[model samples]
Target: SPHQPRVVVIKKGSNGYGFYLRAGQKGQIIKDIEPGSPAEAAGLKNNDLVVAVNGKSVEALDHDGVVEMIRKGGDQTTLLVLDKE
Candidate 1:
């Protein structure tokens, strides 16, 4: 069966999510989440590895590519992630 990705909507700006990334076992992992950022409030946690962006798989994407996709999202970012097991 194909993987069914989960969706996380991140609205940009002050109301936006705040997170930091790092190299991971699979994809880019959530290295740090701002203490009081919207991301933390939205349930994003450290070590949650990013697997896709807006439905586009990030499995084979390099660090730059992943960063580019996120930056290209403008004011609205959507991510599909896998929780650390």
Candidate 2:
């Protein structure tokens, strides 16, 4: 019930942000994250549902909307997510 908000910045593989995402029934979820990737290093886990992107709420947005937000976030995107566990 208790959780913390983490910021995951996806970067180039060399920058340690290699990760893949998929749209879930609810929100965008981490599909895969490379070991040692920025996502991994940032403690982002698979199944973690993305709730916001770049300080903008994504709960009301669709998959396309979320992707667009991330795209606009430039090289690094700040994310707010929740654990699915």
| Reference-based TM-score of each model | 0.81, 0.78
The residue pairs that clash in candidate 2, if any, are 16-38
- Number of the top TM-score candidate: 1
Residue-pair clashes per candidate, as listed?
0, 1
Query: Can you tell me which runs of candidate 1 are displaced by over 4 Å?
Result: 1-5
Candidate 2's C-alpha lDDT?
0.77
Q: Residue 63, candidate 2: how far off, in angstroms?
A: 1.6
lDDT of 2 by residue, 2-84 (tens): 67767676664555366666876678887778876777876778878898888899988878888888878667888888877
**Best model per lDDT:** 2
lDDT of 1: 0.76
Per residue, candidate 1 scores C-alpha lDDT tens digits across 1-85 of 5434456777765845688778764478876788888677776778578888877888898778888888887877788987765
Q: After superposition, how far is residue 43 of candidate 1 from its true place, in Å?
A: 1.2
